[PDB]
């Protein structure tokens, strides 16, 4: 069963052993579904993010297909490149494209942003969330820790390990999947739900980025999950030091309601992103830029 799952994820992946093809494997971070190495493609020096997760240590194993399948050959500006997976002994490697500027999450926790940045990380994302739910993709993870920076402040969208496939005929996904303090209200109570999760998680992403942290943060995930479910949105704490522009935008995302809640492409008519800065100035955020 570990064999036979094994088994099947050999169909799925490229051939091989990529340490023929890579050196250098260093950790540099971690999810709940395993560890992130750079490593350095042999032939060219050119440097790569490895994704290495443990088949026998994840949460729910045959969401290890979602990422490798649905990513395989996409290719938009706002989402980080898959290149390549393999099946290494009882590990999945996935190698991605590397970002140097890190993650939104470093930055979430030790500054504040103003709004043209705000508007500059929502838009990109914004874009990549268009494109995708379009296709039927539901991202599900959507938070700081799923955002990259580019070293010159450009942003895109990664861990596509809890994404899903949805279609016409096949509507809603049920499965209780994400990260606590993001999901969104129907997707905590097991109701039909879509991809307008992504857009209440983007909502407690500007929640994030303005307040410092998740509502509910201070909480326990599984106390937390039954107080979004049972409570109405959340307000931000900073009401004046926040401007209408970003109130409006944040009430089209933070509505219980799915049908009422906005979608991507309305959103990027949104009057708030067109104070979208360009991406150097998301650069002075950046742990290397805002310490002299
Ligand atoms: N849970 C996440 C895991 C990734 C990241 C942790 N490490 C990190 N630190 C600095 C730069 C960097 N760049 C990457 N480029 C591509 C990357 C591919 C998707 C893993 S990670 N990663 C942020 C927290």
């Not at 209440?200 to 307040?211: A, C, Q, R």
Request: with cysteine.
């Amino acid at each position: 069963s570990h064999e036979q799952f094994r088994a099947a994820l050999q169909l799925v992946v490229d051939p091989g052993d990529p340490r023929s093809y890579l050196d250098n494997f260093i950790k540099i971070g971690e999810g709940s579904t395993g560890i992130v190495c750079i490593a350095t493609v042999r032939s060219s020096g050119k440097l790569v993010a490895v994704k290495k997760m443990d088949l026998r240590k994840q949460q729910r194993r045959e969401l290890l297909f979602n990422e490798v399948v649905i990513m395989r050959d996409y290719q938009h500006e706002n989402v980080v490149e898959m290149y390549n997976s393999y099946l290494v002994g009882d590990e999945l490697w996935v190698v991605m494209e590397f970002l140097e500027g890190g993650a939104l999450t470093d930055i979430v926790t030790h500054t504040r942003m103003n709004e043209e940045q705000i508007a500059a990380v929502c838009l990109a994302v914004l874009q990549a969330l268009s494109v995708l739910h379009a296709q039927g993709v539901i991202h599900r993870d959507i938070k700081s820790d799923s955002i990259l920076l580019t070293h010159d402040g450009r942003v895109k969208l990664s861990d596509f390990g809890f994404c899903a496939q949805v279609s016409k005929e096949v509507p809603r996904r049920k499965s209780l999947v994400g990260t606590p303090y993001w999901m969104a209200p129907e997707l905590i109570s097991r109701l039909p739900y879509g991809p307008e999760v992504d857009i209440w998680s983007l909502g407690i992403m500007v929640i994030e980025m303005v307040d410092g942290e998740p509502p509910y943060f201070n909480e326990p995930p599984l106390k937390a999950m039954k107080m979004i479910r049972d409570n109405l949105p959340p307000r931000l704490k900073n009401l004046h030091k926040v401007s209408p522009s970003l109130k409006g935008f944040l009430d089209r995302l933070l509505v219980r309601d799915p049908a009422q809640r906005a979608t991507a492409a309305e959103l990027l008519k949104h009057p708030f992103l067109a104070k979208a800065g360009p991406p150097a100035s998301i650069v002075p955020l950046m742990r290397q830029n805002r310490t002299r």
